Amino acid sequence: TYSPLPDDYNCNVELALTSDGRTIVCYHPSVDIPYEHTKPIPREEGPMIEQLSKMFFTTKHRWYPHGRYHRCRKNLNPPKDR
Amino acid sequence: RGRIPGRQWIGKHRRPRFVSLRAKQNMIRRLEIEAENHYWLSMPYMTREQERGHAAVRRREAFEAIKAAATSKFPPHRFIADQLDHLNVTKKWS
Amino acid sequence: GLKYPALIGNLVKCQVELNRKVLADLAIYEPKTFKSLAALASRRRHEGFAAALGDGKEPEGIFSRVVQYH
Amino acid sequence: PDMPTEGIKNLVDFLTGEEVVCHVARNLAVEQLTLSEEFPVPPAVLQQTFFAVIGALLQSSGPERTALFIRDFLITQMTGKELFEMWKIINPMGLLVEELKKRNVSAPESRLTRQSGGTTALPLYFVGLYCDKKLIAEGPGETVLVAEEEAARVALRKLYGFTENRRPWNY
Amino acid sequence: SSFSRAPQQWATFARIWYLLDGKMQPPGKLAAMASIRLQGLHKPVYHALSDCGDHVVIMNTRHIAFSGNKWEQKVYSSHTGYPGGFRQVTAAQLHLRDPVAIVKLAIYGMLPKNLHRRTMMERLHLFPDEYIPEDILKNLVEELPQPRKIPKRLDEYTQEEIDAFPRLWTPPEDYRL
Amino acid sequence: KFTRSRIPEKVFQASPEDHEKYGGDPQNPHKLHIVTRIKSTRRRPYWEKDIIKMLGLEKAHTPQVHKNIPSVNAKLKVVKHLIRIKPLKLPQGLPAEENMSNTCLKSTGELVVQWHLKPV
Amino acid sequence: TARGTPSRFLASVLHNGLGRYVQQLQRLSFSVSRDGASSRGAREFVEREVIDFARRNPGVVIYVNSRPCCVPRVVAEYLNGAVREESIHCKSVEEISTLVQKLADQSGLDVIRIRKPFHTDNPSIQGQWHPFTNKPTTFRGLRPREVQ
Amino acid sequence: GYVPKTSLSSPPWPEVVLPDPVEETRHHAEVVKKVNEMIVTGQYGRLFAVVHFASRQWKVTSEDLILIGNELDLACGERIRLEKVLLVGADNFTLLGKPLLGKDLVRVEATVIEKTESWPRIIMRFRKRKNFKKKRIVTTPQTVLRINSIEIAPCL
């Protein structure tokens, strides 16, 4: 009956121990989203920069462009990872 | 606004440094270790009178070995092998 | 639902030595593993508290009791 | 065994396509021995030479050695390549409905589980797929339709056992 | 799990909205939690270059309760450009003339002192009343636990708990109070 | 003038309470100590540095054993504020010719001769 | 000096560790000089070490130019196409042997910042973490401040 | 010694209680048997192990690469068996020793691909008006490893 954490999200909690007490074992079965916990799918520079900032909730500094120095300093062939 | 004389760690006036709990606990544990060391250093075993010459042989042997190693200080030897192999810098093929 | 100092202490009080890099990697790419680790840490914390309160006699924590070596 | 014939044929055509073949040939120094014309060698001639070398290894060594070579090279070339990315499909809902009909007829009740924000130009809806009050899979997405498509794709992956939690291989 | 590359990335790097409430609570802990949620520290993938954060919405900023006597001690001063413009307004006056400034300055000072501070502040919203726009209301998701526990006045303990609490002394039967 | 700090005789005098607190005993005392420097040699006089160099404690947090004799006793006391002292009690016999490769120091002074890598 | 030097993520040329192991070293061209004191080591190598090195791994072919050269060089090609044209001017036989062994052991990958010494293809097994993790779900998923 | 319920009569944290030792051991044995049966049935998929090699704990999974900053004196193309694992699992279950796990319980198969060197690292030291200018280049050795697979047995 004891539960160190509430088993109501992500997965359950079941700490186990071996007979020798040398290795710990666990059983964390994933929790399924109930059926009653959902909802039915229902069915110019200055002004433009200000509108973009209000839409993206960002500052008006990064919207302006940069000189050719930073443009050329940018790497167009980044290292493909994964 | 807190204007104080030049250099806060010397002179007639200095900024008042205050102690915290970390330094207090550090000093406490250091004093505990020191008391443990003091207690451990309160129980001899030979009483001096029993150590009037129990290992002088080892000291004499070590001193003799050091003296022999020092007196051995002499330049190295020489061989004709290296002087003759130095001529191989112009090794030629057929 | 835990803190870093208590979590690290409980993890160290179980012979489960794990560096911080692996812990972060698991928390990032394995939420269930970190959840199980946090549950074990909370269990160890509760066991240690119960022991300090009642001095054991004679449970000694089912998860405690380090494995001796020679 | 849960994959259909169409998907298997598409995966075979992809592995035996041109990009992977060219990559393997260029990584095995095969292009340096391709007696062809107009350097660099085109992909068709390169693939033809690669298949000829495979047939040569077959006629020389044997079926077991060729199968081992295949398992070690071609099957290994598709380790990180996720499903669908290699076998492009259109309208995953149709394929999901077909698979369900093959298994059990039951319209998946597309339901919204979680949503982040709303009308903020940067949403994140977690569209699910309830199959008789029993969710089979789910996946997030930018919009609602894209989220449902991703959920259907993840459901198809789970059905075909191609998820990331599958078995690596047996060497 | 599976999840394709681009959708999985967009999901793991998504912006979530939260809701905070005052009503007889200190502003320090609220501002600290707001900054922790804005900087993305609450997430396990916290980093400045990643630009991870979450919008924080605070309501009922007019019912903030300070500890001690900070209402007549905390001076929110600010000097202007022209000379002699050294304004030294107290907390009570600043709240009476602007009830949406205390928590604002608290979160501004709590956040790091980098260029991302302005962006993290713009990501935050404040409202001095229960009225909230429909867009933000629909954007809100979940509600983290509140900081303070509220002392609870005598008009809420119910008569049952009051009767359960026994007396402690016996005043004289003829005490004029 | 900061002269050579000396120590009186009343300091090093273990009392029954001290013996009861620790595990040591007067009768049949230990024969070797476990010296381990826990403080740097810098910021200390030159004679203390010379004593530390003679005792062989260059690398801190390193175990060392010395004779438990009045001379070595005073040599240790000279830097007591810079070294950790503990007794070297051997549960079993001393390391014989056969027990020289499989050994271990172990904390709390417990030189084991049958050092293995298996659980109890 | 990493910002002013190209980098590359750690990865293999063909995942040789999974299946069969293929030698990344392709060919080796030695430019030894017959008459010249600037190639005694290369000559001694080609004399009493190159044969053993070639026989220790028959999956590599070696050439011997033996032309009038003033500085002996070695061209270490690779399958991917990289070339490591190093020089062995005045070097002992042991040094040249160790250099050849190192060249044969390494791959054609560039010698720059490796960044992250690990290439985990599928680092997520129990589901990648997302903002909607370790959180419950109210009845009917009713967002806060929602009547119906 | 009764204490009326007040704001500080009892601690703020919840006073939880642990179960009995007999039932706890029974549940432990039950979960161990369940995990053993699940492992025997072959339900796991894509295992992962935290191998503590080269004095570093790597979150190894499968088909991943590892680069060590030293030499091991091993011909490229030889199978290696790693040990010192202490965190094995996959989905719906985990395994960890105290600290290391049993040798017969886990088996990590790895191989060697290449033995390269590190990029030219530059060492430099400088001081103010002391004419201190020291320079040195270092190229430490490097290696590459590839874990083929991670086997597991029902040894419990």
Ligand SMILES: [Mg+2]
């Ligand atoms: Mg001054």
